[PDB]
């Protein structure tokens, strides 16, 4: 009855016997882990879906209020105008048919894609057979293709988060900065609640919202009630 | 199957309970025999009847007990011993107390119980714990002395 993770402090801090709720959560997560470099909690969880028919291979987003500036980056792909708008709005990687070229050669740094319909085809094809499914060809159905590249990269930097159920039905993302106001954590929490609830593919057949976990990067872990 | 038990506590462990021994099972297989019966207001009550009954019985003994324990534990118990100024030529057996208090003074309590390992006969007087009813003990002051 004695294991191996000094973290045992924080460990005792947590008592997974209850799935409790969103807010109480924000609170105790914060209280829970400010190790080397104050917490950067995260929520992770899974839904009653299935891989086979991609009608459930969801992903997307929902800004969920509160500032930002770093994570799985992106490429703004279009023309001068977009260079300006999307670049300044919130775009680490900035190019279009140009950056596409570069890539074809060897340069590139963007899993996430935001190609506007002014080099949309340019990127989609020129790079189609370049980015491949590593999750990079801007495909019109993943906050990846459209008019306001400025807007998507924009929030990407301004206060973003995204969806992407991994291998067997789980997603990972932030909903309430470190020590940051408990209530705030509650807010982004529920916000994602919905975003998700929405993305929910019509192919579900039972208890959809499954394992609802809020936990921290390196810290405790326990489920919460996307409800009260 | 409200199998009300007479001789049962599982196996022949009498009047311990009532359990479910399915239809015939219970029926002609275990109780026809005659080790119990089945519910009925007649039975359920019956139980209640003798149960209540024992309740009154026990409470009761508790009571006669109390009357004598009080009267006695209060009163002093004196007795005439025969000898020197220590053990007497004879001995003081708690029973001895028994006939002694019993008819010499009034109230009879069975020999058997009481607290007396070796007869005591060291002469003089002792007061000890002689249990009279279950968890209601009677301790008393028996002064005994050479009747000279």
């Amino acid at each position: 009855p004695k294991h191996g993770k000094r973290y045992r402090a924080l460990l005792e801090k947590v008592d997974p016997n209850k799935i409790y709720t969103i807010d109480e959560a924000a609170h105790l997560v914060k209280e829970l882990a400010t190790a080397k470099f104050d917490e950067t909690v995260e929520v992770h969880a899974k839904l009653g879906i299935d891989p086979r028919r991609s009608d459930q291979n969801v992903r997307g987003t929902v800004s969920l209020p509160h500032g930002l500036g770093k994570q799985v980056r992106v490429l703004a792909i279009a023309k001068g105008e977009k260079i300006k708008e999307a670049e300044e709005a919130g775009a680490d990687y900035v190019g279009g048919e140009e950056i596409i070229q570069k890539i074809l050669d060897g340069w590139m740094d963007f899993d996430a894609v935001v190609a506007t319909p002014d080099v949309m085809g340019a990127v989609g094809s020129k790079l189609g057979r370049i980015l491949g499914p590593r999750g990079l060809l801007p495909n019109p159905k993943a906050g990846t293709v459209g008019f306001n590249i400025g807007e998507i990269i924009r929030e990407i930097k301004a206060g973003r988060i995204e969806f992407r159920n991994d291998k067997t039905g789980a997603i990972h993302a932030p909903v309430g900065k470190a020590s940051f106001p408990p209530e705030k954590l509650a807010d982004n929490i529920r916000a994602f609640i919905r975003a998700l609830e929405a993305h929910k593919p019509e192919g579900a057949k039972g208890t959809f919202l499954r394992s609802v976990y809020v936990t921290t990067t390196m810290g405790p872990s326990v489920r919460i009630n996307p409800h009260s | 199957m409200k199998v009300i038990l007479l001789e049962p506590l599982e196996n022949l462990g009498d009047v311990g309970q009532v359990v479910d021994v399915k239809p015939g099972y219970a029926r002609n297989y275990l109780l026809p025999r005659g080790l119990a019966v089945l519910a009925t207001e007649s039975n359920l009550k019956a139980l209640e009847a003798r149960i209540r009954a024992q309740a009154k019985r026990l409470a009761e003994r508790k009571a006669e007990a109390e009357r004598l324990k009080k009267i006695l534990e209060n009163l002093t118990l004196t007795i005439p011993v025969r000898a020197g100024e220590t053990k007497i030529y004879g001995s003081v057996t708690a029973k001895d107390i028994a006939e002694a208090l019993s008819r010499q003074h009034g109230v009879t309590i069975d020999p058997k119980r009481l607290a007396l390992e070796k007869p005591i006969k060291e002469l003089g007087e002792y007061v000890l714990t002689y249990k009279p009813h279950p968890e209601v003990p009677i301790q008393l002051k028996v002064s005994v002395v050479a009747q000279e």
Binding site: - | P23, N28, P32, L38, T40, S42
Partner: protein, 71 residues
């Protein structure tokens, strides 16, 4: 009659037969069994007082025996 019930009759009729389903799941009837039949229970025994029987009928039975059992 020498085969009723004891505690209330059961020696009785019956007209039966059938067809085929599908019904409110793709089809109409399917009918063609004008047939007729029987329909009944069981028999068991215990004791008046050191000699007896039972006879009777299943259920009503269990009840009964319990009853005259009361006496």
């Amino acid at each position: 009659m020498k085969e009723g019930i004891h505690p209330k009759l059961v020696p009785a009729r019956i007209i039966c037969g059938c067809g085929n389903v599908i019904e409110t799941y793709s089809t109409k009837p399917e009918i063609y069994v004008e047939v007729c039949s029987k329909c009944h229970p069981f028999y068991t025994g215990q004791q008046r007082f050191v000699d007896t029987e039972g006879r009777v009928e299943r259920f009503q039975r269990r009840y009964g025996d319990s009853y005259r059992k009361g006496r």
